[PDB]
Structure 1
């Protein structure tokens, strides 16, 4: 670990704090994540081989005196920040479509290898000036865990949590990542969080008010779910046209499929790549201020 020279507190994730570091030898710039059971070690170590242009490369893993340091390739900005920096004008559709396409690409890769992110969010998507967007902290949720809180003396964000997780499902699948990406997608379009809940019940109810209270009709087995309460208010489904304006019909169609209540009905990353919405997909360059 004495091989790096901390440069600045780049972040403060749920696993631990993140610093920008300079490998004293190669001089390469990396993102140093200081965070353990051997199980985790095998887990976060298998990730070292999961490489993809849209996945933030996990350079190395340093476990010294029960201190877990994760070294990732460095990117100068996350989407949350770019999104805030594009607040007045918003991100150009072409760029939105390119980012989702690449993210769907990263997801398809991870999912084909049976790896889930489990906690996608704007702060976990990093961009470079090349017009590239990558998934950060991938597979780090299973490798460890994810409580309502943490040591960072901070609050978790459930804004992007799929309903099956909120309803008590313990064996959720890759479909939770698609739900999360759907929320981010809607957020890139509206420049406003889709379901900014402040508690699990508020989170679930904001979803309910927009997509309608799920029942056995649209979600077979939903009432069997652990945290399902026959007493949930019965909300009507609000037309999607009112959810993500002014996204066009192709996008609203893709989004609605990424937000299906039934995980099994929810569109897969691989299948989303063949959606008409990306028929005219390109790769524009963003304008970043570093």
Structure 2
């Protein structure tokens, strides 16, 4: 078999070649990214005298049709004319090339997972975590403007990128899974660690799922490790329950997949699904306190911030309150961008 007259591999990806020139314009430097969507490459745009990131979508109907949605939303966001539009990556243009839809993005710096990794997963400071938190909240507010109503659907450290290596300004990338509040088309969405209870439970979802993901992200940026690191859905839900307890009955009562994780007693309350021969793996519900994970009264996560400025007890207590409001089980009462921005965690110095 030869795929796409030899230009593609067996997984519908374009065989990237360092040094190649496309359409007398783009010089391909190297692969910088790879996912289910396809690939991302670093490239120099001769015409515009600048570096770009080119997202090369897979040559297959299903992936193309999704990227067309991605392009529509990217263009709709970039088009919008408030100054909040610059927490979102800029889609410069797109084009078809050897049967691949290619999206051209401005060149940003590296992502927040790479940033975590540069400090050997010690975490970044609470001061820097705050700056990310403020910008992300402001960006989620943009996405909430009624004319947009976009759900990113895959927030995680990897999809938040620094603008410049030496500064805190960030932008959100990868709207390849995104949708608007009307036209939702998938039930199994978000990366697992950052997946909301509503999605785990098979319930309808709105823009609040991104705020859940942000809660999880912000904690991980400061501790250096994922808050809820499930190997599968059942593990994931169980790890959430360790920190936040059994979700409220009014939600589980409307949850198509409640019985995947939970069981309903005669009296109308819910427990975790009962386990084989009692073998214990999880901490009892609500026992793994965020208060201890963050190290609120014990010098920060792992004790590593003891006797540093910008990491007081009062600072942590604020941060913890914000995060708990972000991880509200109920998407109707979970904190929303406008009100998150008014939180005491952000208040001026």
Deviations 1:126-161 (A, max 9, x none): 002332011111364339977979xxxxxx940011
- Of the two, which has the highest radius of gyration? 2
Q: For residue 29 of structure 2, give the secondary structure of its aligned residue in structure 1.
A: strand
Residue correspondence of structure 1 range 1-290 to structure 2 within 5 A: 2=23, 3-35=25-57, 36=61, 41=68, 44-51=71-78, 52-64=85-97, 66-87=99-120, 89-112=122-145, 113-127=148-162, 128=164, 129-138=166-175, 140-142=177-179, 157-169=191-203, 171-216=204-249, 220-229=250-259, 230-231=262-263, 233=272, 235-238=284-287, 239-245=289-295, 246=300, 248-280=316-348
Structure 1-normalised TM-score?
Answer: 0.85
Asked if the contact 1:79–1:125 (Cα under 8 Å) also holds between the matched residues in 2, the reply is yes
Q: Quote how far apart the aligned CAs of 1:65 are.
A: 5.8
Q: Tell me, what secondary structure is at the counterpart of 1:197?
A: coil
Q: 1:288 corresponds to which residue?
A: none
For 2:66 and 2:119, how far apart are their aligned partners in 1?
A: 41
CA distance in 1, matches of 2:123, 2:70: 38
Gaps of 5+ in 2: 1-21, 79-84, 264-270, 274-283, 301-314
> Alpha-carbon deviations, 1:178-217, whole Å to 9, x = none?
000000011012111101111111111111111112131x
User: Greater helix percent: which structure?
Assistant: 2
TM-score w.r.t. structure 2 length?
0.71
Q: Which has the higher contact order (CA 8 A, sep 6+)?
A: 1
- In the alignment of these two chains, the number of paired residues is 271
RMSD: 2.5
State the SS of the aligned residue for 1:76. Answer: coil
Three-state SS of the structure 2 residue aligned to 1:61 is strand
Cα 1:29–1:136 change in 2 (3 A) is same
Greater Cα offset, 48-57 or 226-235: 226-235
Instruction: Give the Cα–Cα distance (whole angstroms) in 2 for the partners of residues 146 and 5 of structure 1.
Output: 36
